[PDB]
Amino acid sequence: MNTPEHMTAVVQRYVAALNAGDLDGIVALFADDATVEDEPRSGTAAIREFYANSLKLPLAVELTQEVRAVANEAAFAFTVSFEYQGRKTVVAPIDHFRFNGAGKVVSMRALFGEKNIHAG
Amino acid sequence: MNTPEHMTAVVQRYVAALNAGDLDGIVALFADDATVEDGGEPRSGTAAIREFYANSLKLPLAVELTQEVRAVANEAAFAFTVSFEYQGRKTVVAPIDHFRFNGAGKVVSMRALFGEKNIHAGA
Ligand SMILES: C[C@]12CCc3c(ccc4cc(O)ccc34)[C@@H]1CCC2=O
Numbered sequence: 001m002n003t004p005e006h007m008t009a010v011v012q013r014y015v016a017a018l019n020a021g022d023l024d025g026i027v028a029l030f031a032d033d034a035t036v037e038d039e040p041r042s043g044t045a046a047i048r049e050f051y052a053n054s055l056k057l058p059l060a061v062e063l064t065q066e067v068r069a070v071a072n073e074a075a076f077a078f079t080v081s082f083e084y085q086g087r088k089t090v091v092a093p094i095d096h097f098r099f100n101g102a103g104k105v106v107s108m109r110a111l112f113g114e115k116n117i118h119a120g
Numbered sequence: 121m122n123t124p125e126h127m128t129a130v131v132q133r134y135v136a137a138l139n140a141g142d143l144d145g146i147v148a149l150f151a152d153d154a155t156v157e158d159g160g161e162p163r164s165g166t167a168a169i170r171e172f173y174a175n176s177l178k179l180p181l182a183v184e185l186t187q188e189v190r191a192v193a194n195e196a197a198f199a200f201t202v203s204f205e206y207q208g209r210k211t212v213v214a215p216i217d218h219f220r221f222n223g224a225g226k227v228v229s230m231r232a233l234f235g236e237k238n239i240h241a242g243a
Pocket residue numbers: 018038054059080091093095110117
């Protein structure tokens with residue numbers, strides 16, 4: 001079983017690589033067979049493309065509370081903000097990571113609905 | 121598909137029911153065949169869910185949603201605190217819960233996610 005310390009550090013590395021625009025660094029956290037979701041995309045190529053599309057605009061990302069890490073899972077509340085064509089948007093999801101035995105993320109699901117997308 | 125408004129209302133109603141010690145009001149949110157799981161198997165069906173919540177309600181709880189609900193498709197996730205005190209010693213737990221809903225708008229599964237670092241000794 002993964003340690004909560006390890007899963008928590010991975011969530012912080014994920015947030016860090018988003019803020020730095022470090023696409024390599026994001027993908028390196030995932031397993032070769034991981035899926036991502038927010039069409040559920042799978043495998044390294046599809047994952048890289050998912051994140052490359054997100055990172056067409058510079059993202060400001062912040063964990064807004066402590067991470068919840070248990071068993072082989074972590075859930076975390078956060079914001080992701082971007083500014084383009086004179087408009088700032090702040091999206092407030094909750095993300096859930098599942099991890100494999102080797103400590104890599106095998107699934108991420110970002111949960112948010114319309115009321116969690118704020119155009120201020 | 122469920123509305124996000126309905127799901128969000130249900131999360132709020134769940135919080136309120138916990139604060140009011142309203143056991144039947146909590147159980148009424150769930151489908152007949154729902155599962156609960158917290159942090160060696162899920163509890164399944166009405167009697168087991170009732171027993172799960174009756175045991176939680178042995179101490180007075182103060183539950184607060186600490187951020188907006190996330191609701192989408194047939195699911196909702198939410199951040200909150202649960203605060204209780206036993207023999208003068210206070211605990212604040214900070215979980216994230218996830219509900220799945222059936223087509224009738226009842227909860228078919230609740231998972232509560234929290235670890236040791238999410239259990240805070242002291243008020
Ligand atoms: C997908 C994502 C969460 C949601 C999200 C992101 C980026 C831009 C978005 C734009 C939206 O209109 C709605 C959601 C997002 C994040 C980038 C990393 C991540 O976890």
